[PDB]
Structures are given as C-alpha cells and as structure tokens.
Amino acid sequence: RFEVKKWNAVALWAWDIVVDNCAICRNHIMDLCIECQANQASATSEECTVAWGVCNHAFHFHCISRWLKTRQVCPLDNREWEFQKY
Amino acid sequence: EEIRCRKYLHPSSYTKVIHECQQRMVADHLQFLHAECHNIIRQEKKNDMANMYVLLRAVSTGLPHMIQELQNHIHDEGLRATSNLTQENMPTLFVESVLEVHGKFVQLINTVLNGDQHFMSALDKALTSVVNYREPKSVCKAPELLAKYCDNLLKKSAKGMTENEVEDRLTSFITVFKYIDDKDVFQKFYARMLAKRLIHGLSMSMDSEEAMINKLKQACGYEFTSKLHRMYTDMSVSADLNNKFNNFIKNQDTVIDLGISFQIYVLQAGAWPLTQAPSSTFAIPQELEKSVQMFELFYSQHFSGRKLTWLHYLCTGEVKMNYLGKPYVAMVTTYQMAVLLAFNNSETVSYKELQDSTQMNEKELTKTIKSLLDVKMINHDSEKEDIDAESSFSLNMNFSSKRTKFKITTSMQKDTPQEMEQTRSAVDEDRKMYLQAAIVRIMKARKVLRHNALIQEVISQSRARFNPSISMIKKCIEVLIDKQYIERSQASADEYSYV
Amino acid sequence: LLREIKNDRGGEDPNQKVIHGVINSFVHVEQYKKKFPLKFYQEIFESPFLTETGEYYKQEASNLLQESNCSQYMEKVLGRLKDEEIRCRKYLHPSSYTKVIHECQQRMVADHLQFLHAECHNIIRQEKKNDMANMYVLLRAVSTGLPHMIQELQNHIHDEGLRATSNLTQENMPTLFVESVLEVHGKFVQLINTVLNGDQHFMSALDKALTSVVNYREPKSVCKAPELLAKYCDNLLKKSAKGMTENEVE
Ligand SMILES: [Zn+2]
Ligand SMILES: [Zn+2]
Ligand SMILES: [Zn+2]
C-alpha cells in the first residue's frame, strides 16, 4: 500500500476561445445555457438571451448574471462588465 | 603664459594667445606625443597621463589617438583578466573580475583623467569587446555565465548570503550586464533558470526575484522582462489560487475528499519557457485523477475560456510507503509516482503492466526506472539491471535510509546540452523573426535600398538586442521570397522590391 | 492537350517542348492577323483549358477537404498555386498566365471562403505565425477574403490589449499602462510586418483596436488615459534620483 499525501502540480493555462461560444458553458451562444440545459422541460428556451459587453464579448444572460453575482469582471479580459445589448 | 596675457593684454585675446601657444607648441609636435601615448597609457602613470590628456585636449585633433590607445589597453587588460578563468567557479569570478576592471578604470578616468565622456565611451566599447570574447566560431560564453551567476546568487543556499549583499551585488552586476549585446540569449537562459527556481521553490525570497526583474527592466525595458514579470506574477498569485480552490471545494454540495494535499501552480502558457515537448500521454492515477477533475471543474467555473494544459514533468509530491512499516515519506515526481502506484497494484509487476497502467512513452519510462534504481528504491529481478524486453522487477526490502523525508529526485539543475542547444535554437528563431520584422518595416518605409546600407541599418536597429549575422539576414530574405513578400530589383540584384 | 496537362497535374512530366510547341501553334498561326491575333488561341485551347482547370481544381479542392484540416490545406493549396504558376509558365502563352492562376484561386480559396473564414478565428487567436501567413496569401488574392481576417485581428488585438492593461497596480499605474500598450503595439507591429506583409489594412486594424483599449472607460467613470499618460511624462521628466539617464528619457 502506497498512500499519496501531496501532489504539488504545475499546469499551463492558455486561452481556449472558439468562435461563437459562451466561455462559461463552453457551448454555442445560440444554444441554451448549461444552467438551463438541465430541466429543459421547465425552461421555455427563450430566456437564454445573448448578452454582449462593451468589450464585444458575448455570453448568455444567465451565465454572465451568475458570473456577476461573484465578481464584477469579465472573464475573457479582466475588465469591468457593461451591458450594451441583450 | 595664461597669467602673462592676463596681466598684459586685453581680455579678448586670452584664448587666441593660448590657441597659438598650443597649436604651435604641442600640436606641431603632435607625432611625438602620439608615439609616446601608447607607452604612457600601458604603463599607467597617473600624473604623466593627466598632463598628456590635458595637452592633447588642448590640441584640436590630438585626443582620439589617446582614446584608441586607452581602449586597446582596457581591451588587453580585460582579456588578460578574463581568459585565465577556471571551471571551479566561473560565473562568479568572471563577473567579479569584470567588475574589478570596470571599477578600477572608472576610478582612474574620473580621478586622474577628468572623467571625460569620450574615455567612458572608449571604456564601454573595450569592455563590450572584453566580455563578448567570442572563442572563434564556437560559442559566446557571456550570457550563459551571467545567467548562471544570477541563478547562483538568487538560489536559496546554505552557504550564507544576506538579502542586502545580494541586492547590492545585483546592482553591481547590472553594470556588467549593460554591455553583453547578446541579450536574447541571456533572456532565454534567465527565463529557464527563473522557471526552475520558482517552480522548485529554490528562490530565497520573492523580493529578490522581483528586484532582479526590476533591475533588468530598468536596464533594457518592459518588453525585455514582460515574460519574467508575468512568471513572477503567476507565482505570487498561485497562493491566492490555492486558497480560492480550497474555498471552492469547501463550498460544494458533497464532501469531495481529495485525499491529497493538492497545491496547484497554474502558469500562463505564453509567458513561460515550459512546453509539452514530452508529448507522451501520461495516465494520471485515480486518487490524483479525482483532484485533476475537481480542479478542472474549478478552473472552468471561476475562470472561463482557459484550457488547462497539465505538465507532468514539473509535478512532484509526497508519497507514503506504509506497506513495509512506514519508514519515511518520499518526495517524488508524478512519473515515478505512477509506477509506485502500479507497484501498489501488484507486487509482481512487469514492463507491460507499467505500459498499460501509465500509457507513457518508453524513453521517459526507462528514465523513471533508471532514476528509481540508482537511488536503490527498487531492484531488478532479472539477470541484468538495465533495460530489456521482459523487465520484471519488484519492490526492494533492503532500503534503510536514515532520513524521515528522503527525496529520490534531484533534477532541479539539469541544464543538459541538448536543451541548451534547444534554447539557443529558440533564440535563433526569435532573432530571425526580429530580422524579418526589421527588413519588412524598412522595405515598406523606403522600398529602395542597397545591400550594405540595409546591413548597416539592421545592425543599428538591432544593436540593443543582439549582433545579427549576414547569413541569417539572407535567410530572412529567402523566407520572405518563399512567402512572396520580398523581391530583388530587376535592374540590379543590389536593390530590392515589393510584391 | 488537356490530357497531358492534367497528367502533369497528376505528377508525371510529359514533353515540355512538345506541349509548348503545339500550344504556340495556335498563336503563331495568327501572327499575320492585324486584329485579334489571339482569338484563335483563346477559343480553341484557352476556353477549354480554363473550363478543364475549373472542373479539375474544383474536384481537387473538394478532394483536399476530406483528408486535411485547414492548417495543412493551405500548405497544399499554396503548393498547387505555386506549381500552377510554374506549370502554366512552361506550357501556355504568356497572355493566359493570369487567367489560369486567377481561375485556380476561384476554385480553391474563393469557393471555400466559409471554410477558411470559420477557421480564421483560431488562426489569429492562437497566433499561428505559419498559418497566418498562409491564410493571408490565400485571402489576399480573393477580393472579399481579407475583411474577415482584419476583423478577427482587430478583435484579437482589442482582447489582447484590454487583457494587458487590466488590473494594473496602483503604485506604478502611469508607467504600467503605457508599457502594457507598447508591448501590445510592439508585438503586433512585428507580427503584422513578419506575417501579414506589413499590410496597411492590418496596421489600421491594429490602430483601430489599440484606440479602443486606450480609450476604455470604467462603468460610471471617465477615461483615465489622458491622466495616466500625463503622469507618465511627469514621472520620467522629473529629476530622477534613481537611474533614468538622459539617453533613456529621449
Ligand atoms: Zn452560457
Ligand atoms: Zn438559461
Ligand atoms: Zn470581455
């Protein structure tokens, strides 16, 4: 029996932005959000509007709302978030 | 004569009398002064050199010969003070000797030679020729020795070096570093040693590393140390990231129970010299696979748009060995920890079971068995201890080291010549990229130049970074030909055109 | 004649002198015609050839998308485009040099703009310097190819610039802000010069993207760029006790 106590690890983070994709869910923006992907029967498939910042970054409204409930900063570029469209 | 023309003549003829008293008394006999200048400089006689300098400065065109003689003397002094270095301690004593020469000759110029800026320029050119003493067509040992010097004096060592001594030593060292004219090589080498020292925890203090990065930034610029400062910033924010991950796993629904003291070192990909060059697919053990999954969930939740490339050759951790009575806890790389867990899977294990349990390539695997057997952690049950087709080997019961925290890895220095050549090739590629940028910028600005003027302007533009060669430049024109961006002129091959 | 040029496209090397000699006949017969000395050549051979090279490179481009991704598809297209420049040079009249290449482009790169433009985002964002110099020279020839790379580079510089000038330390914000733009400006001037031919349509894409990051304003606030660049002048034009020599200031 060998028991591992520590696993001090090194990982490289790199940007993985793909075209027309919600960065929080890693899925397409026109599709439903991953928070609304579950219980799809209850969801009306209409409230997952695409929210655009003034930095021209598009997420879903629910995902950016849940993001702003923790931090007021855009994930893809570390600047504050201003809605401009819906 | 000055006091005489002051007490006899008009104020308007003070200079003209002195000018004719010098242009016909120490400028008509200028050949004798210039002939004795070499000897009076090489002997280093203080008052005689001071009077010689005053007289030559009085002459309109009598000083530059003294500049050349002094520069040659400094070049010879630096060459005789840097070519006798041994391999016992080269990075320290090389920079120490260059500092001694520079300080002594700055004192000589400032004290008994008026501190002329032309003489300082000559000293700078002479030391530039000294430290860049290229052994003919083989190497340039200056940037590697400077990087090794920084690594040696910034590494956490038990020899004894206080913070203030290190800081003033680096402040002195920057004067040596200011004239290397191969700073790309030093940048890559310092990035490699900084990566090793930050990851393996060999830094004596983060303040020392930040101060050294600030010194290099003030020496060259923000573009020189942008990557180094991003490395330091990631290493400083690593603690906040670990705290945030622990808060994340404490605030989940169920008890995750990682079972290991996970401590991640998430690094920015573009700013670090690290890469996934060992492209072998590594099978993470299950107890580490749970932690990998949970940190992937965290780094996909609290950070968005970032893919997390895992490095399995910069990872290390403590493993316990309570199977044989728990003698100690071993620090070990994850490559070797995988085969230790495979040993846990079955006492009798072969190479095929290792291959199907780790999925990793044969060279890194064989390196792991070698680095386990040389520390007598394991014994080979076959007739011969080296690699073979079968390779069946079990745990060694005779390991009785006296350390309760014995470490079986020592790959903190490395610096194998293969990766040294890989680093130099990366420098060469970056040099080629910069030369292509300069060539395209100059052509877009002017569209008509000759070969020699192009070479001279490339040297002038890239003087602060490196010393480019003709073959590399012509390779850059060849690459732009292959990309159909450049063309030589139809009238003459000397001139150049645009596609 | 089309068969032994199509066979040349398949790899084999036929008689170059015979093919060029027969092709030269359709234009050397008409040497005594004062008006339209190439009307025979442009209908007997060139019009069938431009149709033949149209239905062949349409078949070849569709044959390359099946077993090649966008990274090595452009290596193959540039290999065919460079070969076709050589191949038509030694076979056809110099008048039909441009028509064959331009019709080759309209079957490989122009018919597959949507495939190249969809992958143009990953080429710019990941900074593939080899693939960006291929997507350029393919889309430079097409009239409507560049205006999507120009947008994707401007979106990349704006996102790279905004990320670089983000969460600067309050201690050295006037100096960190200027040097963060200059490293983004310095990186992308060189990237455009080395890779994208130093194109002015892309330098304007950089200037239109660096203007947005410099003039980026916090919510319910005002742009702090004029204030930060006023302090950067002030910080280094004072009597600097520590370093900052005369040659460095200028
Ligand atoms: Zn979403
Ligand atoms: Zn939703
Ligand atoms: Zn954003």
* Whole-number Å distance between alpha carbons of C242 and B425: 37
Judged by CB atoms within 8 Å, which residues 34-63 of A form the interface with B? none
CA distance A20 to chain C (A): 10
The number of the ligand nearest the C-alpha atom of A57 reads: 3
Contacts of C227 (CB under 8 A, 6+ apart): none
Q: How many CB pairs under 8 A join A and B?
A: 122
Query: Amino acid identity, residue C241?
Result: A
Q: Cα(A48) to centroid of ligand 2, in Å?
A: 4
Which residues of A are annotated as part of the binding site for Zn(2+)?
A: 22, 25, 33, 36, 48, 55, 57, 60, 62-63, 74, 77
> For residue A32, what is the DSSP state?
P
* Whole-number Å distance between alpha carbons of B207 and C99: 66
Length of chain C: 250
Contacts of C75 (CB under 8 A, 6+ apart): C134
The number of the ligand nearest the C-alpha atom of A62 reads: 2
Kindly list the residues of chain A whose beta carbon comes within 8 Å of any beta carbon in chain C: 15, 17-19, 55-57, 76-82
CA distance A53 to chain B (A): 15
Q: In chain B, which residue's Cα lies nearest the Cα of C169?
A: B233
Contacts of A28 (CB under 8 A, 6+ apart): A20, A21, A22
Q: Check: CB of residue B338 under 8 Å from CB of residue B356.
A: no
Neighbouring-strand partners of residue B319: A4, B330
> Do C197 and B223 count as a contact with CB atoms less than 8 A apart?
no
CA distance C128 to chain B (A): 13
**Given A15, A80, A81, which is nearest C125 (Cβ)?**
A15
**Given A15, A19, A80, which is nearest C218 (Cβ)?**
A80
Gap positions in chain A, given as the residue before each gap (C–N > 2.5 A)? none
> Do C158 and A56 count as a contact with CB atoms less than 8 A apart?
yes
**Given B306, B315, B343, which is nearest A10 (Cβ)?**
B315
CA distance A30 to chain C (A): 16
The number of the ligand nearest the C-alpha atom of A25 reads: 1
> For residue C167, what is the DSSP state?
S
SS (H, E, C) chain B: CHHHHHHHCCHHHHHHHHHHHHCCCCCCCHHHHHHHHHHHHHCCCHHHHHHHHHHHHHCCCCCHHHHHHHHHHHHHHHHHHHCCCCCCCHHHHHHHHHHHHHHHHHHHHHHHCCCCHHHHHHHHHHHHHHHCCCCCCCCCHHHHHHHHHHHHHHECCCCCCCHHHHHHHHHHHHHHHCCCCCHHHHHHHHHHHHHHHHHCCCECCHHHHHHHHHHHHHHCCCCCCHHHHHHHHHHHHHHHHHHHHHHHHHCCCCCCCCCCECCECCEECCCCCCCCCCCCCCCCCHHHHHHHHHHHHHHHHCCCCEEEEEECCCCEEEEECHHHCCCCEEEEEHHHHHHHHHHHHCCCCCHHHHHHHHCCCHHHHHHHHHHHHCCCCEEECCCCCCCCCCCCEEECCCCCCCCCCCECCCCCCCCCHHHHHHHHHHHHHHHHHHHHHHHHHHHHHHCCCCHHHHHHHHHHHCCCCCCCCHHHHHHHHHHHHHCCCEEECCCCCCCEEEC
CA distance C216 to chain A (A): 9
Neighbours of chain B (3+ CB pairs under 8 A): A, C
> For residue A33, what is the DSSP state?
P
Most B CBs within 10 Å, among A6, A65, A69, to test the B interface: A6
Q: Check: CB of residue C168 under 8 Å from CB of residue C161.
A: no
The number of the ligand nearest the C-alpha atom of A17 reads: 3
Q: Cα(B127) to centroid of ligand 2, in Å?
A: 67
> Do C219 and A77 count as a contact with CB atoms less than 8 A apart?
no
> Do A79 and C219 count as a contact with CB atoms less than 8 A apart?
no
Which residues of A are annotated as part of the binding site?
A: 22, 25, 33, 36, 48, 55, 57, 60, 62-63, 74, 77
* Whole-number Å distance between alpha carbons of B282 and B365: 10
> For residue A22, what is the DSSP state?
E
Angle at B384 between CA B382 and CA B387, to 5 degrees: 90
> Do B485 and C186 count as a contact with CB atoms less than 8 A apart?
no
